[PDB]
């Protein structure tokens, strides 16, 4: 018969005010976004049991990336207590540099990130997670209305968070769907992704005793304001083996056959040895990420370009490495709020805009999670400043020039910020953040404790005196490049380049430090860096 | 297309519950093995409920255990409530069974697999098998590498062409150009629940034993993680309305009087998550009716559901094109078992993969395989039936058949297989140690049993027939007190004639099972 009996093929009784479409990164950070502002939120994601899936090495943070993690977390996101929780090496980078230009970067057991998150987004109040693809969007005068499922389900909501998904497309290399077609027919501005994995390697075929060590920092760095150190699981070295010239030669003898290991070796030396930093994919694991060999080049190089190598020569891959090309639309096509220009009710955040960190990732999720919820609300979207955090830098630039800012010119640029660092990113942003609903109680708490705390400190420093003749100033200037001819407070002394706040509350008029050492060292930074 | 630099003893394709006890076994067995898994991350993963064991079920794992394979000690580390069935009936009959952490059975599965001597796993679908003279030869991936082995273990994947429902490989066509006989399996999951959105302060729990069974011969309850309850549900008139209309619970309500309220177990998946299992409603049924069956349950009238459930279709394979070693009759060194073969039990796939395993291995290794016997092993009768039938034995069969059976017991998989499994090098040193140990407490307390005694006078056989049932007639061997119903064996070895009482609990229930059923 022709009997098409469309059974499924139906609403949804109970309707929402957002719906997230995907479960990667900013998908996570949205749906937590809406749904601890209080909204009633979905998220559809195709596979419950990839949420917390890292598509690259499994690692967090770094330069610019770790920026906007404190960023994130600052404003009530989960990613830095997920790599809190599931991070194996802690690592501050820049550490002898000065404030503007350090990062916290993390290793992470993909186990422990997957539970992390998943735990954290099925006990999220306002939050229901349906495990299904979207086939389309349902469009209504411009505005979006809800969401049509695969199996043909139907839900009513009205904002929309569009993410990652089938949609976007997706071609693996080695060597239809409704919304693509409704997006295509859009004047929205089609680009081409070109992302790469390397081959896992099989860590009982690798001889770790010729290579190199690298272990996390000790005390270990905490990603999240509101963690301390004990949460984290135990930690593990990487170790580096390096690129030589035999490796060098396999990529070039392979061209042929289609940042890669490839483009690196056309484009540099030879005597320039690429370091590949050997990242452990978890501690239940015997898998390893080499960081540095990502290829499209076919197996069988992949397996010469590996055994090649230090330490390598006996090694197995466990899973081979490929590269994958997606669809992206051109983010200057977005308000910047991440509201699409043509479909309002509909934001944009992620790899649909054509980034690929996880970071920029949940940042970018964060944001548009937080203003569909505004809309479905009826309240004007939040466009985070320049000025305010690189959060705006980065949807200002996406908005404005269609692209990221690059790495590359994040050292050079820093020295102009320094107001954006790290440390400082809840002192930017959890004051709008509790006007927005995105703060909890718990963190609201401590983020005024911790803002008074600093107030005090401050205060008392700038009014307890040694004068150059007290019982106390012989103790004072012994920590000194030259003894005192007139008083001085303990702000004066502070602001000399050989004086630490750690040094100065060790001595008589100024004890005791601070047991809140976030407040601490925020008086130091404040203190010294007025100038 | 490329060949692997290493050749292979054995290639197992497919990572199910078969593929694993495969590599396992040939792996352990010293033979050089490659898996081939299209996801290394879903290994262990469980299609149905998340639970292990069972009536024949159990009996199936603890012959796995026996010959040194994986599935008993994955559950031991994953299990979240264990109860003995049947714990009334006498033993042929008793069946342990365990709830599952679907996480926690996966990182016990992988890792495993990823410290086994031997075993390359590596991640990629196959394209088809190499065939020379009407002997396998190797594997081509879908990729293009060709991997080179003596055997191969053939158990599931794309080829098997499965597709979902709510309401082409050239290994299909090479497959299906033998006169292989091809059928369509239809399995079901339900809808999976979110536990905030059910109440379950009105409903029954169910909790495991105490103290608490152990699956593997080698194992001790400390091994088990938090133990939870299961809360139990009922279908209802309401529901039997929902599922009149709109036409697997859909199977079972209309073949059977509405005069009776099934049970729905409320199956947790795991200590760290919030998904629930309703065991008893799986369904090929559209959402509404799914959302209709779920709400119309006490308990679950606020529920949503999380992942709605679905049917798949699969090509399996008549078993009866293969031999008792579970060598397919066509190709030479090709091994059939688990779902290819029709069967959709984890502990029937587990079974059938422990033996094509060791017969793909022994292959390899230009040895003859092992064919068990109904009389041996449940795995025996299962593989004779799926040889001569094509079907295993309905569940519902095994209560009566059991009378025929009787030496077939959970608790003697050992006794029966373990110098078996040892001979085949499947049984490691540890093992055996401990199984000759075992052995031995055994001999020596029935033989310090048959020749320890007590006559009527006598000191201590005041306090012997006081405990006693009937009066104590004539003379009689310690064998005598265990021999005879209302006397077990923690009484007799407390009353000071017989009162060395055995430190070997394993051994001891052993001797009370063995005296009290000799006649």
Redesign the interface.
């Known amino acids: 018969s022709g009997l098409v ?1 469309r ?2 093929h ?1 609403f949804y ?1 109970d309707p929402f005010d957002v719906i997230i479409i995907g479960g990667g990164h900013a998908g996570t950070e949205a749906a937590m976004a809406a749904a601890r502002m209080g909204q009633q939120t979905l998220l559809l994601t195709h596979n ?2 990839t949420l917390g899936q890292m598509s690259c090495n499994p690692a967090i943070g770094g330069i610019g990336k770790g920026h906007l993690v404190k960023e994130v977390d600052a404003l009530g996101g989960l990613m830095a207590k997920a790599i809190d929780q599931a991070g194996i090496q802690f690592r501050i980078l820049n550490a002898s540099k000065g404030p503007a230009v350090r990062a916290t970067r993390a290793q992470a057991d993909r ?1 422990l990130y997957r ?1 992390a998150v ?2 954290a987004l ?2 999220q109040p306002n939050l ?5 693809a979207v086939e389309d969007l349902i469009v209504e005068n411009d505005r979006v209305v809800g969401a049509v499922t695969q ?1 043909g ?1 139907k839900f009513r909501a009205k904002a929309v968070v569009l993410t990652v998904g089938t949609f976007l497309d997706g071609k693996i290399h ?2 239809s769907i409704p919304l693509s077609r409704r997006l295509r027919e859009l004047p929205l501005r089609v680009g081409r992704l070109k992302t790469g994995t390397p081959p896992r390697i ?1 860590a009982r075929t690798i001889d770790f005793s010729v290579l190199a060590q690298q272990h996390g920092d000790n005390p270990m760095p905490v990603f999240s304001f509101m963690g301390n150190a004990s949460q984290h699981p135990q930690q593990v070295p990487c170790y580096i083996t390096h690129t030589n010239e035999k490796t060098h030669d396999v990529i070039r003898s392979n061209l042929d056959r289609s940042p890669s290991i490839e483009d690196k070796v056309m484009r540099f030396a030879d005597r320039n040895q690429h370091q590949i930093f050997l990242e452990p994919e978890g501690l ?4 390893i990420y080499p960081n540095g060999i990502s290829t499209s080049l ?3 190089v992949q ?1 010469q370009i590996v055994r090649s190598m230090q330490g390598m020569e006996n090694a ?5 490495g490929y590269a994958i090309e997606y669809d992206f639309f051109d983010p200057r096509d977005l308000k910047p709020t991440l509201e699409s220009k043509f479909i309002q009710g509909l934001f944009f955040a992620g790899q649909i805009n054509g980034t690929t960190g996880y970071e920029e990732a949940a940042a970018q999720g964060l944001l548009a999670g937080l203003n569909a919820a505004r809309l479905s609300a009826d309240k004007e979207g939040w466009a985070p400043a320049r000025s305010q955090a690189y959060l705006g830098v980065l949807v200002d630039d996406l908005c404005t020039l269609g692209t990221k800012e690059p790495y590359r010119m994040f050292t050079s640029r820093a020295e102009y910020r320094l107001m954006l660092r790290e440390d400082n990113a809840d002192l930017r942003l959890t004051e709008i953040g509790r006007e927005l609903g995105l703060v909890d109680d718990e963190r609201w708490a401590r983020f005024n404790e911790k803002l008074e705390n600093i107030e005090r400190e401050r205060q008392r420093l700038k009014s307890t005196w040694v004068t150059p003749s007290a019982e106390a100033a012989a103790e004072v200037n012994a920590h000194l490049t030259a003894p005192l001819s007139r008083e001085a407070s303990g702000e004066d002394l502070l602001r000399r380049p050989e004086m630490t706040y750690e040094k100065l509350t060790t001595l008589t008029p100024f004890a005791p430090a601070l047991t809140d050492e976030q407040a601490a060292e925020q008086v130091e930074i404040q203190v010294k860096y007025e100038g």
């Open positions: 009996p059974g499924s139906m009784p419950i049991d186990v539970q998943r735990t099925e006990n229901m997670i349906f495990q299904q199996m389900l080695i060597g099989d239940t694991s015997n898998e076919p197996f069988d397996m197995k891959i466990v899973r081979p």
